[PDB]
Amino acid sequence: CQDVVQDVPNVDVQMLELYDRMSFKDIDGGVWKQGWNIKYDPLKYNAHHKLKVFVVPHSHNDPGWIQTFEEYYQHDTKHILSNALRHLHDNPEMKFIWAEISYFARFYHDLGENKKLQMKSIVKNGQLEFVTGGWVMPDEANSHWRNVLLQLTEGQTWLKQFMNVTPTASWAIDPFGHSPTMPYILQKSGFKNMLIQRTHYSVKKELAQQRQLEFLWRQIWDNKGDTALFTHMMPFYSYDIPHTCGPDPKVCCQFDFKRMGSFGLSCPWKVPPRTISDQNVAARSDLLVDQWKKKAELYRTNVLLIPLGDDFRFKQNTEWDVQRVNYERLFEHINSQAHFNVQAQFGTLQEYFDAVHQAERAGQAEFPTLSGDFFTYADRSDNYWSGYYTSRPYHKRMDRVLMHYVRAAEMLSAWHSWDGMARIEERLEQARRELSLFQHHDGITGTAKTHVVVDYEQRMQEALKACQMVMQQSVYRLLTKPSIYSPDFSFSYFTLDDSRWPGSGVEDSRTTIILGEDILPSKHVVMHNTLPHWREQLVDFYVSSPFVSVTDLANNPVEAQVSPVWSWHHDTLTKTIHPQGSTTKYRIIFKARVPPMGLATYVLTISDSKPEHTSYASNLLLRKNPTSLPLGQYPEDVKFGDPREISLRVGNGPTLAFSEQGLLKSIQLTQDSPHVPVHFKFLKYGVRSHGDRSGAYLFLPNGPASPVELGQPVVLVTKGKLESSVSVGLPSVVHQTIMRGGAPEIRNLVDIGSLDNTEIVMRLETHIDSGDIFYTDLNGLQFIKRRRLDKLPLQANYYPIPSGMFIEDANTRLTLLTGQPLGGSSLASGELEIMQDRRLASDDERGLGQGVLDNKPVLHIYRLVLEKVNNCVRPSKLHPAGYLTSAAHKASQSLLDPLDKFIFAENEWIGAQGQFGGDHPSAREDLDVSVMRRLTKSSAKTQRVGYVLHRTNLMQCGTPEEHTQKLDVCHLLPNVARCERTTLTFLQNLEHLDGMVAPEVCPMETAAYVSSHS
């Protein structure tokens, strides 16, 4: 295994290093506004060395943006694909590339058999070529790597089954900035090449000058380079035709033949395209070839890529004709005129890359190595696209919830083969597809129109319900005596209980377990642990009585704590935000211990009086002018008092101190250690009254944030043996700090209401001497070192915080883990900040045509980990990566993949069992079974189950960490006939494993295995 910590990779281009040196000056470079006047030696190409030009027709189809997926399909995409089939069929030399499989599958299944065959033929013959082949062209900032893989697999599995092809070249022309997580996944999925486009204009200029636009992109910790994937970065401002033929859009626009009038399109540079004729072809060719040769100066081979497309292009038959015929005339002339020394033709993306590597092998070009990422993107001036790191946070959080439900549903149902009547495969396909669709760069990014966001939400809601159905049917089968098991595949044996989604104050959705002497004495509940190691976690349920005791199936008492059910309300009368307690519902809390990838059953029983093993939390409401707060049967009376500073400690965990405003002030790790200053503060960013305005994409603050006026907020303190908390009703946010014995959990119920042109940020202020360094993660896969650059505007220093961020000095580190992707930064030494929500009244000129005014209450969750790191073996000062500690990693897992909770629906569960998976191996803490998916239906003689195994890298800080079993996923199911290592999509077998044993992976490595069972 490679050492991902102590060996700084030697690369030609390291993006953090490049950023430190670049000046980012935005000067007018001429026709190529953000570049320079490209010059070339006409004698460079000749009869013995010609410029090979591949014109690649394409159509950018967004699976939802200003219209929903279905609306676009009906109005544009079905016509684009129908006419592509006809035109390619009739013109053998014409080519076309396609990226979004969600649309292609929608189209294909509606085609008659005759057309399906014609379509398969033009794909088999190479005219229509799929690029990437994912369900969508995913966002690369907010997306979790697990979902990027999910959607890639969904699209490629469909392609293999129906088109019999697996793309090895990726095409990503629209994500707003790019992540190295893509080449990581692609390279492990059979890919050999990838193309990107949206990178900072300053980066394009810098790399272009050094002809480093094509490079071998390796991971920041990869010293050997085995993760490298050849990457092509487009050099210009856009992927449209005016910005893909050469440096001068005024000239290039003249070669987009759809801009003549009848199509309602024109050239903003004032010179329209002119139909090619024998009379003007020589002059037109001279202009075009000149542009091509200028573009070619920016690359190292004699093979040039010229994309030919734009948004939803190649729709009308007349459009196919005008583009094809005119280019055909140009090709005939150019290729016949030796003085040009050019051979141009329509081509596909794979053809371009194949030619490039042929030139490379011929020894005519050597490519530079590169590591790093391409955030934060700016397409012009100071317009940095960091706003979408937060836009529509409700759905960003929903993405993470569904991410987990899909994993849990696929894993729980994978243990058995199911009869087709159970509709398991059907429900799982639906769930995978709706979540995959949301990975689109206008989905999770929060950059779609209001009604489109609603469509995505509805789709994800249906997906969650599908997951619940599969999960509950699976639990019933896994924990019921076989000879008693009598399933009704439409019946709900269990109801899922989720305490953090939609969340308290967002939607009263969870059911109350109703117990009573005259109705029902007890209730069975079951917890699922999707992680491959034994896990304990506090779980809570709503019960109709405070007198409830918990037992495991062996009838062993389990210590429990009961707390009131508190709800916060904006009292329109008193004009205050205060909590009201329920007098009919209560929360029971207890520690559940669940087997690796297993289940554990518990029983809740009611009693007439306080049970021996259940304690009750005390409650203190701090504020002036208090009023009584009755809690029905709840044992202890609520206490009141004027606002004051308070300190709390649960178990042997840390001691937290809070200000009289209910905000964290300090953390004391041990009774001996000191009170480390850690202050939570909420501030607000505004919008400029002059110039460019912030919108769904852009973050253009009118200066540093201003503190939110808190006034004298109401603070609620709940103190319990198992769980304590401090909650405060601040303007726009009910802020809560929960303590359970370890790193606290933070929950923010964010309701920005009608606060227009406001972005709410949560900041942490500490004494950590971090300077200008901080770390943020990329797709929940790796942590990358960031350097605050004062030479760049505030918004440029904002980065995606898909799952976590941290700052540190020689001795101390503060890590903030998130349960949802949001934007954040460290604008000053010792600080960390993350945006909660943003409400913008205006559009930011990127085509959306609206601001962001559809905000809705969202419950953001986090874990705050303060640690001493002076003993940890960390990367050198020059290493571009950072790594989490065991505690921080486990805290992240507690947010993203918590235990699942099931409540038995009926009064009695006959044949109930107390546990499942007790014999499952408990793998080392840094290893995870990211995916467990049965790949075959019940009729298959040989069953196949696929697993995606990921091993992260945790810092060694002197903790023994021992006793763990080897995890061999290939033997998790009995009767294993073979074990094979496969690409991450499970589509290609890479190795036949002897002994049918799937070996564990190395740190920061991800592998896939498929076990076959007879």
Ligand SMILES: *[C@@H]1O[C@H](CO)[C@@H](O)[C@H](O)[C@H]1NC(C)=O
């Ligand atoms: C799929 O393509 C391969 C070539 O890569 C070919 O050998 C095989 O017969 C094809 N399968 C079908 C009929 O779809």
Ligand SMILES: OC[C@H]1NC[C@@H](O)[C@@H](O)[C@@H]1O
């Ligand atoms: O300008 C941004 C916007 N342009 C049109 C579409 O491609 C959409 O996805 C994108 O966000």
Ligand SMILES: [Zn+2]
């Ligand atoms: Zn797009």
